[PDB]
Amino acid sequence: STGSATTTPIDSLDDAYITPVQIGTPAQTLNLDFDTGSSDLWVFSSETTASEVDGQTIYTPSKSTTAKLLSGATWSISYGDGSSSSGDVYTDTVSVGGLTVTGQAVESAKKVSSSFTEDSTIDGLLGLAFSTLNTVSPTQQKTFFDNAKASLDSPVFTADLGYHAPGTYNFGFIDTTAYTGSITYTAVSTKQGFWEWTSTGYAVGSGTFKSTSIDGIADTGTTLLYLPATVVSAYWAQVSGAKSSSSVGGYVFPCSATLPSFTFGVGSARIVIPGDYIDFGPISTGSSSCFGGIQSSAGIGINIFGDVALKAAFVVFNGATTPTLGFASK
Numbered sequence: 087s088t089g090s091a092t093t094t095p096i097d098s099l100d101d102a103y104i105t106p107v108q109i110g111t112p113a114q115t116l117n118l119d120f121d122t123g124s125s126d127l128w129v130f131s132s133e134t135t136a137s138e139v140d141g142q143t144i145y146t147p148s149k150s151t152t153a154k155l156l157s158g159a160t161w162s163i164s165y166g167d168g169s170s171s172s173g174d175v176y177t178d179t180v181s182v183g184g185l186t187v188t189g190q191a192v193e194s195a196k197k198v199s200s201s202f203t204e205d206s207t208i209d210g211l212l213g214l215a216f217s218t219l220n221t222v223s224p225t226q227q228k229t230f231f232d233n234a235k236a237s238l239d240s241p242v243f244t245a246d247l248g249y250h251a252p253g254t255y256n257f258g259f260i261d262t263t264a265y266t267g268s269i270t271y272t273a274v275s276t277k278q279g280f281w282e283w284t285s286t287g288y289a290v291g292s293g294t295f296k297s298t299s300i301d302g303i304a305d306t307g308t309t310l311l312y313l314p315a316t317v318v319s320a321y322w323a324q325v326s327g328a329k330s331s332s333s334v335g336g337y338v339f340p341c342s343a344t345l346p347s348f349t350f351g352v353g354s355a356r357i358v359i360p361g362d363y364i365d366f367g368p369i370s371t372g373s374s375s376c377f378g379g380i381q382s383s384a385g386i387g388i389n390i391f392g393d394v395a396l397k398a399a400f401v402v403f404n405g406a407t408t409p410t411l412g413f414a415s416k
């Protein structure tokens with residue numbers, strides 16, 4: 087089997103991407119944030135504290151003839167940005183782009199943090215990291231991809247995120263029309279539960295490529311590119327007036343600037359992030375200070391190849407017995 091679904095930016099800055107997912111019988115379609123950095127499929131629901139729902143579409147398990155309470159199971163997750171959610175668990179039929187999994191754990195939120203309440207466009211998350219990170223207790227549950235994998239034509243999914251435009255998540259096949267050149271594959275460590283790999287270096291604009299190993303994670307659920315402070319300083323030093331602002335929480339730059347590109351290495355291959363992808367717009371409405379799309383990972387404990395990086399590439403998440411990651415230009 088295969089599936090193919092369009093993923094759409096939630097706003098004009100590409101702050102996140104939402105993908106329609108069918109849950110239950112008859113289908114209830116919710117727009118979920120596909121997140122290769124976590125491993126829980128959770129949704130706003132009829133159980134979510136009413137004051138914490140503000141415009142999201144909710145899953146109502148009592149209206150699904152295939153929903154079953156997973157008795158005794160609870161979940162609770164805290165994300166790296168400080169967001170969180172928790173609740174109980176149903177199993178139900180879940181379909182993405184024509185690919186169906188029966189008995190998928192659907193984690194129903196009883197509580198969500200304010201960041202989720204305030205984003206009316208995100209009805210939940212669909213985790214695509216390794217199932218060892220799933221938070222369901224006392225019986226850990228599998229991700230949608232892990233449940234689907236044996237049925238797929240090939241044990242892979244691909245992320246093709248757009249810049250200020252829709253893109254595609256495919257399951258079970260590699261669309262050879264969606265990229266240019268060849269796909270370069272690189273090793274993955276699953277020891278932390280992430281799609282963790284080592285970039286071979288970077289360049290700023292038209293500058294020379296610096297060969298240096300940068301361990302990090304491919305994370306579709308994180309907006310920006312978080313890299314070591316040395317790398318980030320070298321980037322922003324090429325932008326007149328750019329500075330790190332403690333009060334704003336990162337590097338800012340004059341909105342009048344034209345940003346240089348940023349290149350990262352995948353083996354001997356190179357992925358080029360155009361400068362415009364690194365502009366996240368005014369820090370507050372009407373400001374002439376703009377927020378940078380490349381930020382330091384120093385306070386995080388891990389480097390994160392988030393959407394800013396991944397949207398410059400066609401990315402293969404290869405879930406074979408030994409997982410690997412592939413990157414192609416597009």
Ligand SMILES: C[S@@](=O)c1ccc(CN)cc1
Pocket residue numbers: 102119121123124165166167169201202205208211307308
């Ligand atoms: C809009 S939001 O509050 C959000 C979405 C995804 C993650 C996982 N990286 C964390 C927070």
